[PDB]
Design an enzyme around this catalytic site. Structure first.
Site, mmCIF file in Angstrom:
data_model
loop_
_atom_site.group_PDB
_atom_site.id
_atom_site.type_symbol
_atom_site.label_atom_id
_atom_site.label_comp_id
_atom_site.label_asym_id
_atom_site.label_seq_id
_atom_site.Cartn_x
_atom_site.Cartn_y
_atom_site.Cartn_z
ATOM 1 N N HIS B 123 0.857 -1.187 0.000
ATOM 2 C CA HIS B 123 0.000 0.000 0.000
ATOM 3 C C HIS B 123 0.894 1.238 0.000
ATOM 4 O O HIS B 123 1.042 1.884 -1.041
ATOM 5 C CB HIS B 123 -0.999 0.015 1.178
ATOM 6 C CG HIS B 123 -1.938 1.200 1.175
ATOM 7 N ND1 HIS B 123 -2.313 1.865 2.324
ATOM 8 C CD2 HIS B 123 -2.506 1.889 0.151
ATOM 9 C CE1 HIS B 123 -3.113 2.875 2.016
ATOM 10 N NE2 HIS B 123 -3.241 2.916 0.703
ATOM 11 N N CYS B 143 -0.793 0.107 9.485
ATOM 12 C CA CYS B 143 -0.907 1.474 8.985
ATOM 13 C C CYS B 143 -2.284 1.738 8.391
ATOM 14 O O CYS B 143 -2.878 2.785 8.646
ATOM 15 C CB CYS B 143 0.200 1.754 7.958
ATOM 16 S SG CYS B 143 1.776 2.048 8.733
ATOM 17 N N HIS B 144 -2.795 0.819 7.580
ATOM 18 C CA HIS B 144 -4.151 0.948 7.073
ATOM 19 C C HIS B 144 -4.847 -0.410 6.988
ATOM 20 O O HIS B 144 -5.868 -0.523 6.286
ATOM 21 C CB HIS B 144 -4.181 1.672 5.704
ATOM 22 C CG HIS B 144 -3.382 2.941 5.653
ATOM 23 N ND1 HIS B 144 -2.117 3.009 5.103
ATOM 24 C CD2 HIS B 144 -3.671 4.193 6.083
ATOM 25 C CE1 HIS B 144 -1.660 4.247 5.199
ATOM 26 N NE2 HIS B 144 -2.583 4.986 5.791
ATOM 27 N N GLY B 145 -4.314 -1.455 7.635
ATOM 28 C CA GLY B 145 -5.054 -2.692 7.846
ATOM 29 C C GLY B 145 -5.044 -3.782 6.788
ATOM 30 O O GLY B 145 -6.083 -4.403 6.539
ATOM 31 N N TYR C 300 -6.058 13.854 4.787
ATOM 32 C CA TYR C 300 -5.646 12.464 4.887
ATOM 33 C C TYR C 300 -6.885 11.572 4.863
ATOM 34 O O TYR C 300 -6.862 10.486 4.279
ATOM 35 C CB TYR C 300 -4.755 12.293 6.110
ATOM 36 C CG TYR C 300 -4.362 10.916 6.543
ATOM 37 C CD1 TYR C 300 -3.326 10.295 5.817
ATOM 38 C CD2 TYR C 300 -4.769 10.327 7.712
ATOM 39 C CE1 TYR C 300 -2.810 9.097 6.138
ATOM 40 C CE2 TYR C 300 -4.232 9.083 8.069
ATOM 41 C CZ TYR C 300 -3.231 8.480 7.251
ATOM 42 O OH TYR C 300 -2.641 7.248 7.494
#
Ligand code: HEC
Ligand code: HEM
Ligand code: HEM
Ligand code: HEM
Ligand code: HEM
Ligand SMILES: C[C@@]1(c2ccc(Oc3ccccc3)cc2)OC(=O)N(Nc2ccccc2)C1=O
Ligand SMILES: C[C@@]1(c2ccc(Oc3ccccc3)cc2)OC(=O)N(Nc2ccccc2)C1=O
Ligand SMILES: CCCCCCCCO[C@@H]1O[C@H](CO)[C@@H](O)[C@H](O)[C@H]1O
Ligand SMILES: CCCCCCCCO[C@@H]1O[C@H](CO)[C@@H](O)[C@H](O)[C@H]1O
Ligand code: FES
Ligand code: FES
Ligand SMILES: [Sr+2]
Lengths: 256, 179, 429, 256, 429, 179
Positions: B123, B143-145, C300
């Site tokens: 990612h 960080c984002h799964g 973000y």
């Protein structure tokens, strides 16, 4: 201390079109490796640069083999290992032996005349000439004024100017009589101390010129790139100046 | 004729080139320097790695995962069907670029015990957490799964591809050469 | 410009200087500009922003006298500042929290502009210069945050540089060029330091142009009615000179702002920070809870809201033959969210300047303010349900406001009559 | 991982008028040296700071004596020597034991609630509370879900949230059931492990509270200086705001 | 000012921008300023200085992306640039030799002003702003030279900071404050780095005021006769617009300067340097032949010329009860040499602007130019006889020119009549 | 009345204080930091130093010369009369500030064997060259030509003062404590 006389060697790399002689740099690398390296290091020179264009230009496999002889402490591991091309040459093994990475630029062989700087303007700074003069400037007998007054552990050299001098070698106002002074480096070279592969001559003169040239490359590895760029900018700016001249001339015509 | 119109063009053309010649080296100085371009392979001693242990090593400023997979890890990997994978490419520098992501093509050995891969989430570059984490008995990226399975193949999350596998080979009985 | 009286040298020294370099004439004409009398407390944020830039610059230069931009020394040199440099702890917290004050102020500054139509003609240039300043600020703050070389520094840098790797074709080149290698390493730290120093001076040059811009047009006011310019007589009924009346009023507001700010720095200097940045950068382990600084969170949140399952993403992927995936789409959305805001003078099709006299606009405006707060909040949450949807609705409204509502509103809305003059509104208060 | 619950300790240094208890910092220093130092280092703390005001404030002769126990490698000499006050505390002896210089600021004990940040705004970040909770949070029996499933070399801790968890302690969607997780640090404290000179009680509670305060000072040694300045700036600006308020009001008086 | 035509928006885009921000009107009125037609080749050095400032800034920013301000890493980081960084060898030599080009140009720029009376009314402000720029340049270059941390860097920094230790009473405090400790060390390197980055931006700001200064008054010209402003008819006979006539003339001259400059950088980049700065800083051993950079040599020669045996120093020492010894006297003499040059508008009592029409003045000026070359040369020699005397006579003449000759000359000299107008002079050539 | 005259003074006065309070810490951060303020004494082993040897040591970023003087050095130093010296002060931190620059007051011991001084030229801080250089059998400063004698006293050149002697004392038979 002061400046002194150096032998004006005609090195190939001098002059605006001057360039390094590849075989001479390879021979000088051998001289550094077999003689100077025992005491002197080159801590700022990456070993991998022996392959880079504009230098000895050794095959990368030879350089990989050359780097092994050094014992390097790995940065991550902390344990000892064989050397890689990405490592620098080691520091000087002898504590008072200066690093030779930039020696060909950290010494001036040409000075004066009246501290006008005209000598260097035409003959260059003179570092590799200076190195050559020290390697060559070891006489077999010292000057007569110190026959039996030589400092122990020091050696008379014609070109070295920063050394001590016996009291018997100074005049009535204390200025030294001798051409040079006493250096802590014993004469490192001697005829055919190195066996060159291509059969090139290995006199003290020949090795001193070869290793002086190699040490010039080690100090200024990008010498050839710098001159190519200089030439290019100069040829460009000649054209650009002419065009800008004609434009300036043809513009002011409708004024005067 | 074309004598007085041409000078103001030729002069400007030289000026444009001169600016470009000044601008390119100002950009290229930020591109990788000679010290970086030259970084070469490394060797990792692995004799100390028991099954179920992941060894993490730095290579080109990024993590490399070396997991000696257990029997459970290997069984799970071969049990996954190709049509169930997010990315069916091996992402393996050692074999064909188009090779399929079967469990055999994700390990160095035929037995499938030694899994070597870049520990860099596909990612946005974070490090996934190992030790049998996530929902597929593999790695979990915090960080984002993203979830990776026991062979390092992407199964769930934002990551588009399997963790890339660097050039790696056993040089002898106990040493892996990366790069 | 507006009719006003001009400078006249009086002292013998003034007559001497004015006939050579009229710098005294310039300070007088600047500080005595007739300014609308009816400015409210939302007109202070320009001075607050101006103060922040000076605070950041002065504390920055000082910090750079004791800081080392090298991965082996960077983190240690900041602790050296905190522990050993005289007042170093205070100078450091002022610089760090000063960045937060800088960013609370722009967002209030911007939403002021969005409400009162300070971006509509003749103020497009002021607005566009502002947008450039804002872009520079974000770039400056990002690189600044990397310099301590903590865990958020390193991994925040990893994440944000990865954004550029998502650009089709050229992405990997851009990413390597920014990094100076295959990964965030010393080369990256070394160059961010140079640029963190440079850009604040570029910001200062832009602010200089920014200030020139609203001096050319004159300040907007809450009514959106311009100062009358047909004579000096009626310009003075709409205005008072900037000095002393609005200088002191701004300085007062600044004293109140700094009172609060110095309470933060003095008593909770780390509230707005992330503890993981007090841990040294580890390129082999990533904090579990990495989160951006609050002033980056809304954008973000937009970036990560557009995953591959999102229906609009799947159309983009289909129409673009696979070029635009969710990763790159999210990057387009993030820069796209700022861009549509830059274009708001040309998207707001209403001829009414002030949102005070736009009944339907107030609703959509206050939803946008709430949306921005919502967006800030979801940015720090996980991407699981329902936050994945919350961030999708929040991202969606932002583009709807600028791209659909504002164009449509200007062709439907029935505005209220504004006052005849600035003078009328003031006397009623 | 995630956030969790910490015991709300009333540390003296909390609140705007809060200050360090000098004797508590000394007790914490004793705990660190005698227990924690075996594994944890404080590589950012200069030893001389044990004398600086706003800390333990040990006499410089005591600090000089304390520094001796450490073996430091002199940078120039390269040979080992006794520690001086100008040296920092050593690095962690145990490679995976984190440095404690900044631990009390590198950890948050208060989180949430809906990621609104209101909890930290009123209760502080909670780093020393967190440290206290970890030192306190080692139970004799693990949670019932892992009766015989403990990873070897790890220990259950109530407050640690970033540790591994057995498969039997997760629900159908994989989220952990337990208040805490498994940490590689064995329970470091035990009743009367340290013999305090002033006779202060050395229960696990007391040592954990004392050393957490010490670790807060080691992390934020200038806390007290910062608050004096904070108070001062606020007092200046309160006065200045009032004066600027009256001036602004009395100025615009001649307009409305 | 001079009569000339003003900007008028023509394109629809120009009308749009001019009604919001007249930046095009400002750029037009600037580049089309009527400039005296009779400018010679000594008026090019302003553009060279402008170019140098950009070169130093652009190469400087780039070098700071790869340089590390720490005593253990500084010297190595410069060699890393030289060997590894793409174009690093060229960027470094450009910045180093660029400082020399920068400084040759100011001295030529300055002596132009001294000959043609470009400092006399109405141009004092232009001159004084110029003096500040020169001081900033010297300060920038000194600190820049320290950054590589070679032997000249370290010991030059030791010597130059020792000058401030010579101030009575407060000298040691100033010295410790500059050094950050008892000696030149890392604290010194670290703060010199921050300040080396800052000051070029201060120079840039000063140059903007500088340009504003001589645009307000108009350029001086070789005759010293000002442009006629009584009508547009006769202003045009004295002037041509800056663009294209003098833009192209300057760009041509600049290309010629850079041809020479790039030959130096390409073919003798180390000629103007000291080989000892290729030796790492050794705080325990000093090169025997330490010598300053050529652009500091004249003032250095002035400093060391005033020793304790000099009759005028001994009077100063006795009258001042020992406060002013030779060391501090030399420091006063050194900054004093710069100060009298700043005060020359008030020391030159002649009403004739251009020195071209001042017969006795030409003699003493060319002695001053010769004296300056002599001063540069003795600066690089030892202080033994006769150089001690050469530097005393040369220093003496420097102060005599500004403080005795120039005041006396304006009440004695019989000047020649200048032309009536610039036009008269132009047609005669 | 003093009600309307006092506010414009009191407000501005507060502003003046506030600016000053902000400027002082911007200056004082450049004053020596606590790590520098804390530097303490050092100890030097001397057992290997024969007469005629100068030991050169770094202390507070500057050289300290520790020379074990020969017989010739001592005789020359003691033969100089006070009225022949440029600087007649001993420059010795260990004794009274007014002590005379006799050779006895320039050495640590009564035998006059141990000369300890800052190798920092009192002109502009360069390092004098030791061994037996210059015109007075002592030290020569190459920066601007100062000559020091065998006791480190200034005799010729721009330097105004004798090389200073730091706090120095023999801690035992073979170790000197500087500072
Ligand atoms: C030890 C047996 C040496 C070997 C082999 C070489 N060098 Fe040397 N070198 C040595 C010492 C102890 C010194 C210091 C001399 C001093 O008086 O300080 C040197 C010095 C040099 C120098 C510096 C001369 C100067 O101007 O300072 C140079 C230029 C030099 N050495 C070159 C050199 C070369 C090229 C060698 C291999 C052919 C070589 N040295 C070998 C000790 C030793
Ligand atoms: C460093 C950042 C900034 C500084 C120093 C600054 C400064 C100022 C100042 C002093 C004013 C006048 C006082 C006021 O109305 O508050 C002003 C007005 C304004 N600024 Fe900014 N500003 C900054 C950022 C921005 C940004 C980021 C934007 C937009 C995206 C912006 C747009 C505007 C607008 C639209 C006005 C109104 C001008 C008018 O009414 O004519 N500014 N600014
Ligand atoms: C608009 C101007 C600026 C902004 C928004 C800004 C922002 C920041 C931020 C957010 C940080 C991270 C601080 C931390 O987390 O510890 C930082 C660090 C830093 N900045 Fe700036 N900065 C600005 C100007 C400057 C300038 C002009 C300089 C130097 C001349 C500077 C020097 C530094 C240094 C040395 C650091 C690292 C030390 C530290 O972390 O405090 N800053 N900056
Ligand atoms: C970065 C440094 C400098 C820059 C870019 C600069 C630039 C210029 C330029 C472009 C001009 C236009 C006419 C010309 O070229 O003579 C000028 C004029 C002038 N400059 Fe400079 N200069 C610099 C430094 C100085 C210094 C150091 C001095 C004096 C100590 C000085 C004094 C003057 C004077 C007296 C004039 C003539 C003004 C007139 O003709 O009205 N300048 N300068
Ligand atoms: C504008 C006027 C400037 C002048 C006259 C100047 C002068 C110098 C000088 C004389 C040196 C020593 C170079 C050498 O011989 O090795 C130097 C080094 C350096 N300068 Fe500048 N400088 C200027 C602006 C800047 C700026 C704006 C930067 C921005 C970062 C900068 C960065 C550096 C760096 C990093 C070095 C050390 C690397 C090196 O020595 O090549 N300079 N400067
Ligand atoms: C302060 C901050 C930041 C500031 C402005 C930003 O804006 C951008 C700047 C450049 C390019 C894209 C966005 C981005 C991050 O810097 C930084 O590393 N972080 N932290 C972070 C954490 C998680 C993911 C990504 C980043 C910031 O918040
Ligand atoms: C480049 C140079 C320099 C440039 C401008 C200067 O101008 C001044 C700066 C500060 C104070 C006084 C003069 C001074 C030194 O700085 C530096 O290290 N040197 N070298 C040097 C050598 C011997 C003695 C003193 C200095 C310079 O020439
Ligand atoms: C004086 C302006 C022109 C400078 C460029 C001339 C080309 C310089 O060329 C240089 O000459 C030196 C001796 O002259 C040599 O030492 C160098 O090898 C050579 O590169
Ligand atoms: C709302 C803006 C003013 C903020 C200042 C209020 C004073 C905050 O004070 C702080 O409160 C924290 C607990 O919340 C404590 O942890 C700190 O020790 C204390 O200094
Ligand atoms: S970085 Fe691994 S999921 Fe985004
Ligand atoms: S520094 Fe020693 S003589 Fe000037
Ligand atoms: Sr030659």
């Amino acid at each position: 201390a002061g400046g002194g006389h150096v032998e004006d060697v005609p090195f190939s790399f001098e002059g605006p079109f001057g360039t390094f002689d590849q075989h001479q740099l390879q021979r000088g690398l051998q001289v550094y490796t077999e003689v100077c390296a025992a005491c002197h290091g080159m801590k700022f020179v990456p070993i991998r640069s022996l392959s880079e264009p504009g230098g000895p230009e050794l095959p990368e496999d030879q350089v990989r083999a050359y780097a092994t002889q050094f014992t390097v402490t790995d940065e991550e591991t902390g344990e000892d290992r064989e050397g890689k091309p990405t490592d620098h040459f080691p520091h000087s093994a002898l504590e008072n032996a200066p690093d030779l990475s930039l020696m060909a630029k950290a010494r001036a062989g040409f000075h004066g005349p009246m501290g006008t700087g005209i000598s260097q303007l035409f003959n260059g700074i003179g570092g590799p000439e200076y190195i050559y003069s020290v390697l060559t400037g070891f006489p077999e007998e010292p000057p007569k004024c110190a026959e039996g007054h030589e400092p122990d552990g020091f050696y008379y050299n014609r070109a070295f100017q920063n050394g001590s001098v016996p009291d018997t070698c100074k005049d009535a106002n204390g200025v030294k009589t001798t051409a040079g002074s006493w250096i802590a480096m014993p004469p490192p070279l001697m005829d055919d101390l190195v066996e060159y592969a291509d059969g090139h001559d290995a006199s003290v003169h020949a090795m001193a010129e070869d290793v002086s040239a190699f040490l010039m490359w080690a100090a200024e590895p990008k010498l050839m790139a710098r001159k190519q760029a200089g030439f290019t900018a100069v040829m460009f700016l000649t054209v650009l100046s002419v065009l800008l001249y004609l434009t300036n001339k043809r513009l002011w015509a409708g004024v005067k | 004729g074309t004598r007085r119109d041409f000078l103001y063009y030729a002069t400007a053309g030289a000026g444009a080139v001169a600016t470009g010649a000044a601008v390119w080296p100002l950009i290229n100085q930020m591109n990788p320097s000679a010290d970086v371009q030259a970084l070469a392979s490394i060797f990792v001693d692995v004799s100390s790695v028991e099954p179920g242990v992941q060894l993490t090593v730095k290579f080109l400023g990024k993590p490399i995962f070396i997991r000696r997979r257990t029997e459970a890890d290997i069984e799970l990997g071969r049990s996954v069907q190709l049509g169930q994978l997010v990315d069916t490419n091996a992402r393996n520098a050692n074999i064909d670029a188009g090779a399929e992501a079967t469990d055999q093509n994700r390990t160095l050995d035929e037995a499938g015990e030694w899994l070597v891969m870049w520990g860099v989430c596909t990612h946005l570059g974070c490090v996934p957490i190992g030790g049998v984490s996530g929902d597929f008995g593999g790695w979990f990226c915090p960080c984002h799964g993203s979830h990776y399975d026991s062979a390092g193949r992407i199964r769930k999350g934002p990551a588009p591809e399997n963790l890339p596998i660097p050039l790696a080979k056993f040089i002898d009985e106990t040493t892996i050469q990366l790069g | 410009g507006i009719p006003h009286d001009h400078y006249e040298p009086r002292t013998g020294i003034e007559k001497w200087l004015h006939s050579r370099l009229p710098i005294v004439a310039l300070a007088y004409d600047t500080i005595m500009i007739p300014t609308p009398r009816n400015l409210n407390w939302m007109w202070i944020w320009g001075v607050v922003l101006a103060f922040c830039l000076v605070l950041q610059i002065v504390t920055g230069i000082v910090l750079a006298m004791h800081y080392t931009p090298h991965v082996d020394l960077a983190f240690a040199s900041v602790e050296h500042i905190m522990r050993n440099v005289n007042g170093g702890f205070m100078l450091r917290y002022l610089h760090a929290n000063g960045a937060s004050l800088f960013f609370i102020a722009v967002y209030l500054h911007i939403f002021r502009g969005l409400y009162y139509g300070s971006y509509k003609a003749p103020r497009e240039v002021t607005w566009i210069v502002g947008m450039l300043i804002y872009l520079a600020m974000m770039a400056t703050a990002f690189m600044g945050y990397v310099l301590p070389w903590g865990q958020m520094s390193f991994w925040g840098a990893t994440v944000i540089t990865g954004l550029f790797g998502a650009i089709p074709g050229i992405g990997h080149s851009i990413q390597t060029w920014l990094l100076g290698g295959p990964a965030v390493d010393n080369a990256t730290l070394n160059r961010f330091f140079s640029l963190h120093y440079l850009l604040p001076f570029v910001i200062a040059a832009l602010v200089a142009i920014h200030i020139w811009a609203f001096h050319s047009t004159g300040n907007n006011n809450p009514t959106g009615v311009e100062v009358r310019r047909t004579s000096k007589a009626e310009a003075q009924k709409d205005t008072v000179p900037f000095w002393p009346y609005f200088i002191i009023k701004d300085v007062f507001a600044l004293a109140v702002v700094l009172l609060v700010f110095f309470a933060i720095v003095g008593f909770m200097p780390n509230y707005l920070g992330h503890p993981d940045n007090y841990i040294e950068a580890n390129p082999l382990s990533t904090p579990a809870h990495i989160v951006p600084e609050w002033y980056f969170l809304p954008f973000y949140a937009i970036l990560r809201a557009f995953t591959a399952d999102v229906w609009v993403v799947q159309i983009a992927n289909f129409i673009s033959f696979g070029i635009i995936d969710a990763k790159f789409f999210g990057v387009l959305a993030m820069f796209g969210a700022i861009l549509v805001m830059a274009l708001v003078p040309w998207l707001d099709t209403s001829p009414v300047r002030s949102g005070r006299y736009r009944p339907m606009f107030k609703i959509y405006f206050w939803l946008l303010a709430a949306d921005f707060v919502i967006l800030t909040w979801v940015g720090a949450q996980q991407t699981t349900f329902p936050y994945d949807w919350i961030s999708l609705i929040a991202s969606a409204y932002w583009f709807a406001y600028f791209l659909v509502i504002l164009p449509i509103l200007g062709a439907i809305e029935k505005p209220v009559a504004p006052p005849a003059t600035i003078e009328e509104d003031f006397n009623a208060h």
